[PDB]
Amino acid sequence: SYDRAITVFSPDGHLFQVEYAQEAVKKGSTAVGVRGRDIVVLGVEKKSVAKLQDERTVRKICALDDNVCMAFAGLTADARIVINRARVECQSHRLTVEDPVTVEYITRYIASLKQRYTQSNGRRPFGISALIVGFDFDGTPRLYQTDPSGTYHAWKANAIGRGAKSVREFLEKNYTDEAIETDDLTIKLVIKALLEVVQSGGKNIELAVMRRDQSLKILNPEEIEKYVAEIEKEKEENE
Amino acid sequence: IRALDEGDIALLKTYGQSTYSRQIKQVEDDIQQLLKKINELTGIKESDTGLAPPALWDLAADKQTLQSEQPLQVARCTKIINADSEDPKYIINVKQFAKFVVDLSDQVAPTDIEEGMRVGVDRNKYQIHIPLPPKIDPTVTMMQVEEKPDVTYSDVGGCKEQIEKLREVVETPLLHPERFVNLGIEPPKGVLLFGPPGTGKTLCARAVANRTDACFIRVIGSELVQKYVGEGARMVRELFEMARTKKACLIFFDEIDAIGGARFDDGAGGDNEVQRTMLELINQLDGFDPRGNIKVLMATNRPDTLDPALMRPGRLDRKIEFSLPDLEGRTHIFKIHARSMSVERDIRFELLARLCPNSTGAEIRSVCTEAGMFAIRARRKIATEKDFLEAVNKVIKSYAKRYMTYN
Amino acid sequence: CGKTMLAKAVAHHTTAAFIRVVGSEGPRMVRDVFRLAKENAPAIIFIDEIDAIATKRFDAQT
Amino acid sequence: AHHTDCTFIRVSGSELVQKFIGEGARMVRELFVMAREHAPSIIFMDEIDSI
Amino acid sequence: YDRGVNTFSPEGRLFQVEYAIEAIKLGSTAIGIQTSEGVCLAVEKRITSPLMEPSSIEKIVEIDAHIGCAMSGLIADAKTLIDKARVETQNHWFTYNETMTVESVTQAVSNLALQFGEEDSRPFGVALLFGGVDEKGPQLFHMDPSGTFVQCDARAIGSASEGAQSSLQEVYHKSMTLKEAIKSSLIILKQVMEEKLNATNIELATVQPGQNFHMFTKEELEEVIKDI
Amino acid sequence: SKLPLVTPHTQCRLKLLKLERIKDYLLMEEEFIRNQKQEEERSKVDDLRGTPMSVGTLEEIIDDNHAIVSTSVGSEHYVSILSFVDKDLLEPGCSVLLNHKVHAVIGVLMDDTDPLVTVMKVEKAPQETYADIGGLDNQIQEIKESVELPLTHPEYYEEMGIKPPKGVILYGPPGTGKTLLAKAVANQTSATFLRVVGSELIQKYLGDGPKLVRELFRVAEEHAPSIVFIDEIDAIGTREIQRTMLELLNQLDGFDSRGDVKVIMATNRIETLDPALIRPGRIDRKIEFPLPDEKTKKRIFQIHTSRMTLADDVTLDDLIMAKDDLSGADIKAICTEAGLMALRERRMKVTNEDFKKSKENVLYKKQEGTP
Amino acid sequence: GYSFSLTTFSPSGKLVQIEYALAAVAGGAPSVGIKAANGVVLATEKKQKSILYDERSVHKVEPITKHIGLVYSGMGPDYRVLVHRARKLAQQYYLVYQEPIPTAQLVQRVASVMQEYTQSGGVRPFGVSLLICGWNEGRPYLFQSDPSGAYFAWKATAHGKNYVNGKTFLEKRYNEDLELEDAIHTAILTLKESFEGQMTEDNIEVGICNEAGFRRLTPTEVKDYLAAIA
Amino acid sequence: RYDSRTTIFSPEGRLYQVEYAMEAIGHAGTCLGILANDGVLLAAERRNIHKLLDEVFFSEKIYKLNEDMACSVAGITSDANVLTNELRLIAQRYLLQYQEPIPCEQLVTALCDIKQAYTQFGGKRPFGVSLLYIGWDKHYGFQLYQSDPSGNYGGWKATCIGNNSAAAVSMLKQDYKEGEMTLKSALALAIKVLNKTMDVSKLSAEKVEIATLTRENGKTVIRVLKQKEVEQLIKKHEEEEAKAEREK
Numbered sequence A: 001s002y003d004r005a006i007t008v009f010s011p012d013g014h015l016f017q018v019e020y021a022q023e024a025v026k027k028g029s030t031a032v033g034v035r036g037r038d039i040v041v042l043g044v045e046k047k048s049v050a051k052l053q054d055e056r057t058v059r060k061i062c063a064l065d066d067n068v069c070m071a072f073a074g075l076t077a078d079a080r081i082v083i084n085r086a087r088v089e090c091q092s093h094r095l096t097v098e099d100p101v102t103v104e105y106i107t108r109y110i111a112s113l114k115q116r117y118t119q120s121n122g123r124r125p126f127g128i129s130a131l132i133v134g135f136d137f138d139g140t141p142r143l144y145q146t147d148p149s150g151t152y153h154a155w156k157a158n159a160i161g162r163g164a165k166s167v168r169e170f171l172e173k174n175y176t177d178e179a180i181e182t183d184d185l186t187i188k189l190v191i192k193a194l195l196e197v198v199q200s201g202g203k204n205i206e207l208a209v210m211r212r213d214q215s216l217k218i219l220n221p222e223e224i225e226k227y228v229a230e231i232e233k234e235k236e237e238n239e
Numbered sequence B: 001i002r003a004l005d006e007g008d009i010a011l012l013k014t015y016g017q018s019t020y021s022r023q024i025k026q027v028e029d030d031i032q033q034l035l036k037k038i039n040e041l042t043g044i045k046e047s048d049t050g051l052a053p054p055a056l057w058d059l060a061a062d063k064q065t066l067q068s069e070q071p072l073q074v075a076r077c078t079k080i081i082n083a084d085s086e087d088p089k090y091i092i093n094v095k096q097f098a099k100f101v102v103d104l105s106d107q108v109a110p111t112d113i114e115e116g117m118r119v120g121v122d123r124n125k126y127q128i129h130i131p132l133p134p135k136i137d138p139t140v141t142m143m144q145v146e147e148k149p150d151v152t153y154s155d156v157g158g159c160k161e162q163i164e165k166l167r168e169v170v171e172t173p174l175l176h177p178e179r180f181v182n183l184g185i186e187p188p189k190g191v192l193l194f195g196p197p198g199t200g201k202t203l204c205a206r207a208v209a210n211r212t213d214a215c216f217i218r219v220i221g222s223e224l225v226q227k228y229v230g231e232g233a234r235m236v237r238e239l240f241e242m243a244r245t246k247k248a249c250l251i252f253f254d255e256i257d258a259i260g261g262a263r264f265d266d267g268a269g270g271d272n273e274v275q276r277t278m279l280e281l282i283n284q285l286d287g288f289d290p291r292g293n294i295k296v297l298m299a300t301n302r303p304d305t306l307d308p309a310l311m312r313p314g315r316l317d318r319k320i321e322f323s324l325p326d327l328e329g330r331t332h333i334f335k336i337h338a339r340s341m342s343v344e345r346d347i348r349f350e351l352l353a354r355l356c357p358n359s360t361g362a363e364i365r366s367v368c369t370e371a372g373m374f375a376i377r378a379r380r381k382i383a384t385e386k387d388f389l390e391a392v393n394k395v396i397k398s399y400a401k402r403y404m405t406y407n
Numbered sequence C: 001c002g003k004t005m006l007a008k009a010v011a012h013h014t015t016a017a018f019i020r021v022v023g024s025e026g027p028r029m030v031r032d033v034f035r036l037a038k039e040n041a042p043a044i045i046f047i048d049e050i051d052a053i054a055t056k057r058f059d060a061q062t
Numbered sequence D: 001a002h003h004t005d006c007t008f009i010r011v012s013g014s015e016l017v018q019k020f021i022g023e024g025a026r027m028v029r030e031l032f033v034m035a036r037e038h039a040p041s042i043i044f045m046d047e048i049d050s051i
Numbered sequence E: 001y002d003r004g005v006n007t008f009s010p011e012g013r014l015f016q017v018e019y020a021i022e023a024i025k026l027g028s029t030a031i032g033i034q035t036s037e038g039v040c041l042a043v044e045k046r047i048t049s050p051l052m053e054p055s056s057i058e059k060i061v062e063i064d065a066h067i068g069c070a071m072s073g074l075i076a077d078a079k080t081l082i083d084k085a086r087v088e089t090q091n092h093w094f095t096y097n098e099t100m101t102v103e104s105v106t107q108a109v110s111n112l113a114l115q116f117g118e119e120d121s122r123p124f125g126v127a128l129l130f131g132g133v134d135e136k137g138p139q140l141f142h143m144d145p146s147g148t149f150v151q152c153d154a155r156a157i158g159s160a161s162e163g164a165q166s167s168l169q170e171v172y173h174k175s176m177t178l179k180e181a182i183k184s185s186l187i188i189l190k191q192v193m194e195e196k197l198n199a200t201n202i203e204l205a206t207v208q209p210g211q212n213f214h215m216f217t218k219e220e221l222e223e224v225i226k227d228i
Numbered sequence F: 001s002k003l004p005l006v007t008p009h010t011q012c013r014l015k016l017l018k019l020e021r022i023k024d025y026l027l028m029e030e031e032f033i034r035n036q037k038q039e040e041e042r043s044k045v046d047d048l049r050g051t052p053m054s055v056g057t058l059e060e061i062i063d064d065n066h067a068i069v070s071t072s073v074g075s076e077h078y079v080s081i082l083s084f085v086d087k088d089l090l091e092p093g094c095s096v097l098l099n100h101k102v103h104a105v106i107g108v109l110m111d112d113t114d115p116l117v118t119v120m121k122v123e124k125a126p127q128e129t130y131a132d133i134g135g136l137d138n139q140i141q142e143i144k145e146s147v148e149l150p151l152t153h154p155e156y157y158e159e160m161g162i163k164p165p166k167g168v169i170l171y172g173p174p175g176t177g178k179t180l181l182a183k184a185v186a187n188q189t190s191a192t193f194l195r196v197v198g199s200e201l202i203q204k205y206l207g208d209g210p211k212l213v214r215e216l217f218r219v220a221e222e223h224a225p226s227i228v229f230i231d232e233i234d235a236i237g238t239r240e241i242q243r244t245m246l247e248l249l250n251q252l253d254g255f256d257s258r259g260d261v262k263v264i265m266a267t268n269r270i271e272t273l274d275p276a277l278i279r280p281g282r283i284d285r286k287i288e289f290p291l292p293d294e295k296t297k298k299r300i301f302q303i304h305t306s307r308m309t310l311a312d313d314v315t316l317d318d319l320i321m322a323k324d325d326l327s328g329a330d331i332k333a334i335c336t337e338a339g340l341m342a343l344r345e346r347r348m349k350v351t352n353e354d355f356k357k358s359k360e361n362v363l364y365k366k367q368e369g370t371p
Numbered sequence G: 001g002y003s004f005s006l007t008t009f010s011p012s013g014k015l016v017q018i019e020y021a022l023a024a025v026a027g028g029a030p031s032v033g034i035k036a037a038n039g040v041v042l043a044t045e046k047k048q049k050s051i052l053y054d055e056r057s058v059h060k061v062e063p064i065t066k067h068i069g070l071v072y073s074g075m076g077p078d079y080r081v082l083v084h085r086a087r088k089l090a091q092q093y094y095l096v097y098q099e100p101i102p103t104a105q106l107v108q109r110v111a112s113v114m115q116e117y118t119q120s121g122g123v124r125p126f127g128v129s130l131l132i133c134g135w136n137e138g139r140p141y142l143f144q145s146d147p148s149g150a151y152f153a154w155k156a157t158a159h160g161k162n163y164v165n166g167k168t169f170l171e172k173r174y175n176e177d178l179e180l181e182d183a184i185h186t187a188i189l190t191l192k193e194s195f196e197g198q199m200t201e202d203n204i205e206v207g208i209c210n211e212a213g214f215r216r217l218t219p220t221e222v223k224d225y226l227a228a229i230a
Numbered sequence H: 001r002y003d004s005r006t007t008i009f010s011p012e013g014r015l016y017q018v019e020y021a022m023e024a025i026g027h028a029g030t031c032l033g034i035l036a037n038d039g040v041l042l043a044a045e046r047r048n049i050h051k052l053l054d055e056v057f058f059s060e061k062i063y064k065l066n067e068d069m070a071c072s073v074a075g076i077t078s079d080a081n082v083l084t085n086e087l088r089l090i091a092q093r094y095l096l097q098y099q100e101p102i103p104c105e106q107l108v109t110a111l112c113d114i115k116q117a118y119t120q121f122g123g124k125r126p127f128g129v130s131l132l133y134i135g136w137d138k139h140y141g142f143q144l145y146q147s148d149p150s151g152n153y154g155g156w157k158a159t160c161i162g163n164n165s166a167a168a169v170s171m172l173k174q175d176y177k178e179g180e181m182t183l184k185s186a187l188a189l190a191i192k193v194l195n196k197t198m199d200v201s202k203l204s205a206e207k208v209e210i211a212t213l214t215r216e217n218g219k220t221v222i223r224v225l226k227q228k229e230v231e232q233l234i235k236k237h238e239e240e241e242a243k244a245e246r247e248k
């Protein structure tokens, strides 16, 4: 009894289709999220504006809350679908619940949606993983990751996509146990990670910052290039 | 871009050279041609022949025997006419040559010649004079072990009950037939060994072969499985005949799962031929005619897969289970493997055994070896408990070797 | 209707040798019959009801 | 193949399939055996997309 | 006989949920001990990286202020089972005001587990261990994807459950104090499973009849580490 | 025998001097050979084996000097053995020279049968060396400890009482140098090298698979110090094919004593390998071949572009940089295609931009798929 | 091939089942529909297996509305279910908009239902090619719909057995300023070319749309055009 | 089999069926949205080639969603028809709810979302249609969008799909113009790319269908080009190639 399906198990017990969804996520581009001392930063790479293409339309970073934002890496159609579901869920929770939305609740909602979409015949699972950063952890920053297995986890800093194997080790190489003072330093570390882009140019990295109390903040290419220059100056110290 | 015009390659390979090009390529061509000249001058190398050390051989006896004796041809005997038993007459078959009616020589006797019997015969009269042994297939006769492995029962760890019960059948009746005969009991004649891979089944077979003292024949699945039909059955026939020739014999089948697969028909006939071979075997073990003093050993990793007729007692009388070693067995095998090494005297082996998960004896030998490589890579002439713990870690983590399906 | 009759009659009147294979009878067979045809220079090959093997090509599954 | 004076060897991908396991491997390896024994040569696989 | 549970093999065995037991096997282990002093659960995290928040992996959970749970297998299906157990306890207590017997919690979760070919998906590839207390006794229970459940005094589930179960069987008796049973569980998990104890990859949860608070063990493993 | 290895490769007079040294020596060979008994032994033996002598097969040996021999007509003859024939060199299946008239055994002929495995004996390792491979140092020490050190210096293991490791699997993405490392270790220790490519042991004939592996191990042990390489073991590794697996596993672990032959098995899909073939008892050494890092990539670029004429403007670092996206084979592809691109525009001295567009085009041809 | 299932794509992007339906089409009854300067003429044959079959009992040209005439490719029962659906759809449009259904719009709705049958894994499309003649706002319209759900406008066309000859015929035997009488003559001529065997009042039936109204020919008129003419 | 059902991934995670839908789009008639400012255009040459084709609508490729919205068609004919009807339905929903014109990106996302939902569920065949949108809205004004069967959508200033789509986008990136490249230059470039992609020497007027949106009175107009304007456009391009010849 090989896989051939979504709701049957291999003789050793593994469900192969969720693994195939994991591989489909692995095909996607890089996405490395972190949480700092107070702020959370994000940087997406491999924009690859195709001359006639205008980059803005694709919206590789999307915000669906009073304050929460990131896209979902993988197939962008499932990304837009889950974007619509996240909009609906966050607005409904804010309108219906006595208190506003929290990052844990929306992360659990997304995980449960993926699980309930997987747990049936004739229903293709969402082959997309995401990195959620929220503000209201009782006024603290925190980061979650969502996996098409309908699973959610809480990272201090995580990477998914084409560089998932690499950047994570990079994180394990230098994610400072000292909480990042001057969260601009954490943003510079994120820029250094984005220097490991699929094109590695660093001139088209789209970055977002949110200080756990602020709304969504977007970093323009020139000011992001300023942090890239600071990181390059730090790197040139080896002389 | 235009293609490389002949002038373009000319200038490409001319302008870009060093001022050395001509000399060193010409010198290389001289290398090649001088090599060929040396080869032709020295001639070809003498392939030679046998020709044992010169002082060992010849004597005029060699040529005298060559010019005096007869290069006898070999013929299948058949149908002793025995028309009057004063001169019996025989039929002979010279393979791919002919069939003759012949008589004995002045040397051989009628009692010395039987039907078939693969006799020899002269080259022009075709009179029969030599008793020759029957044709045993070479690919069957090389199967006899001819050399005992360097393993004893003391090298097998933990399986005291298994080795006792197997020696009860494969060793005790040969060593002490008196116990069985004076008590008037018939001992078992077939032992099957089953268990997970790497538990020591082939090691037990090696120990038995070392302590057998009788004719021991190993058997492997690939040996029996020929391409042509019936040929494997033929080899098993010859193998059992060979076993009958010996005064008692031991037959060992390693991984009999290769041939003993249960018979099935609906698969468009299935493998069938392998089933035919194992059917000839299932007859030879117990069919018409008593098997003889032939005690038989099979070891397999899939006991349930074999055909039920092969599991049947009277052909497989005693079935033995080699399970994963217990803590005491793990300690014992660790001792046994550590006997040969140069290690610390104070190695607390039972600690290592209780660090071991449900590890087969193959894993024990592997971790012992990994400690050996740790010591050697450290260039130390003594293996230490630290080396053993790194070996345990290496082996266990290697066997353990996204995985988000876990809890 | 006489396809095989008329092919046979043409072969008999001419110096040709008449080889015949029915389409219900893989590509190795086609190469073999063509090679056999080559062995006799004026030979004639006849395929009977070739439609079974010469049906329209699409994306084939099995 | 004609102009470069190298030998021409042709084996179609449809010819590669065969009805038995262990034959395509053998046939390809021995095809390159003829390729090497003929020395300067070109190997053609017409309709390699069939496999 | 591979499409689903609705097919019977010649030996009667459904060739779908044996793979569910094998899916129990692929998951990380969980240990449970039932003692007169208290019922305890131990759980291995199998932590991929220290950048992970170790508590984020919910392989040890609190069903209610009188019952905790550990489990092995698939984490999402386990979380669904845990959610049902919690809402069942909430509803039953809010309605009847009587404490939910842990066995009743197992019954409800098992009845959910019987919802793949019994109505109108697939078996829940996860096995659970419950440890709870009630007005009539402290209990430990185990259940599997098949929907069956059993009362156990010392149970091991997940990967390498055989060796840990053998050690747990050999060390267990009916008169252990919770301290000695806990310590035996920790030393067994240390020797067989991964390594020396640490707060990053192992978790403990104990339940006592008179203690509805602090159902877990947290930020106090230090006294263990030096004295283990 | 072969020529020495001249190890300048740039066109310099050092290369010349080495060459004319070699020419001097070969010319002395020519001189010496051009500037140019046992008739009793010959008159006895080579006249007893009166020409011509037929070639047949030995089947059985019955007496000290009596044996059964078949010939190409298929007939069977009980003949005598002359004393000069080495008895220990005679066994069933051996090719034997026979007197034409009286068919008497007059010597053993060195074997010229079993053609296929005779071809796969290759022994043609010397195209590479540990030199040709750069950066795979952990793998190098691992395989050295496993197979190379026991062959070169079994003294350490015998003194330690250690039975050496008896199986190695190499794994990793393709183009990482597993085959190169196997050939290189075959070159370092001149033990006979045996290579057999995966699926090629899968055969249509029912016996041919296990039979082929049996004869390959037979020839390997016949050569005694030997290394056997099975690349893409996955083709077999992942009843008949399982029976070939059983044959190989038993040839590894099973009865008899194997001795000195070492086994290297290379796979691209190690995780798909069946548990049986990965024997903890036999296969204790699994060597991963990761995609090369920055240092390893730099080493491979230097190794491959070393033999090419290079311009000054080539900045190797921008080629090395980005990530571990590719393997050594891809690096060789970039070097080769950069050579062709320099050739088209008529450079015999490749430049930096050549490598830049070469890596760009390779990355274009690397993988595919709709966005 | 990829024909046993209707709801899947082939590697080349073809859904083989619907061209199988189109192969069922053009294997059925031959028929030709042309557009004249004033009106639209659709002609189809009536030839059964045996003389017992009273052919007048089964009309093939059916008036969807007094201004719409409909002909099919030969798939009888599928044509009947589809023509019932088309009649009901035309009635819905006639009552909703209080105006008669446009010919192009009617064909659009019919092809929409056709497409509705081109999905799921337990149904099959009606392998029928539909020729629709109509009058709308003083303009004549001839449309063709096919089981794939597609529809197109033809000045002249034909389908059924031997349809390529009808295509060539309407290629060289047509001009857009044909009068109605000459249009019917062209239709019966291409019917003669496409059909095998002679025809009488029994063997053909024709429907003509004129801007005042549509009407199916009486067999006597069908013989008047087919016999004693051409 | 993996490729038989849309809900099964490859072991690499790729989906075969939507890929087959794109290779289907490979057969589609060449059609592009051209690069224009202060205006936009959707040229779509008709693959329909036969004398007796009536083309009574005079438009079968470009469909007007509203006087500020037009869409192109490249895919399965019936799927395209039902999809265009669904576009008009969704625009009607948005307008009836808000009494405001729908933004380009919102409508495009809505259609692509329902397409993805249809592809996601089992027992249903993915819509083998890719399409282009030309529109003007409050938020961004002139916009051209491209959408695929998978439900992916994006913004392109100049793009082409259908027959030789890769070649078309290639020469569009070759002689790419920006800024002062107004609507008339867009017509010229569209004529150039259509003559290059199509095999017809002296490309015929009836073979090509062109439409364009321009902001008149702030209420906007979408004009589908009639025969005459296409005629002198093609003739002017022919004499422009003649002028390019005159340079030699």
Ligand SMILES: Nc1ncnc2c1ncn2[C@@H]1O[C@H](COP(=O)(O)OP(=O)(O)O)[C@@H](O)[C@H]1O
Pocket (backbone or CB within 6 Å): B155, B156, B157, B158, B159, B196, B197, B198, B199, B200, B201, B202, B203, B204, B299, B325, B333, B336, B360, B361, B362, B363, B365, F253, F254, F281
């Ligand atoms: N109980 C044991 N005592 C000593 N050595 C053992 C034991 N079990 C396994 N080994 C070692 O591991 C190897 C096991 O091989 P074995 O299990 O006999 O192969 P197979 O499973 O094919 O019969 C032996 O070579 C032996 O050296």
Ligand SMILES: Nc1ncnc2c1ncn2[C@@H]1O[C@H](COP(=O)(O)OP(=O)(O)O)[C@@H](O)[C@H]1O
Pocket (backbone or CB within 6 Å): C001, C002, C003, C004, C005, C006
């Ligand atoms: N025109 C014919 N005249 C006489 N006999 C015929 C004719 N056509 C067919 N037959 C008979 O039919 C038999 C088989 O015909 P065959 O040549 O196989 O026709 P086809 O090739 O069309 O099947 C012949 O034995 C022959 O007697």
Ligand SMILES: Nc1ncnc2c1ncn2[C@@H]1O[C@H](COP(=O)(O)OP(=O)(O)O)[C@@H](O)[C@H]1O
Pocket (backbone or CB within 6 Å): F132, F133, F134, F135, F136, F173, F174, F175, F176, F177, F178, F179, F180, F181, F231, F266, F300, F303, F327, F328, F329, F330, F332
């Ligand atoms: N570390 C390396 N050093 C030098 N060459 C390498 C290296 N890795 C790969 N190569 C190149 O790749 C090829 C070997 O690929 P390899 O990985 O051995 O194939 P396989 O995957 O079949 O074992 C050789 O041509 C070699 O030049």
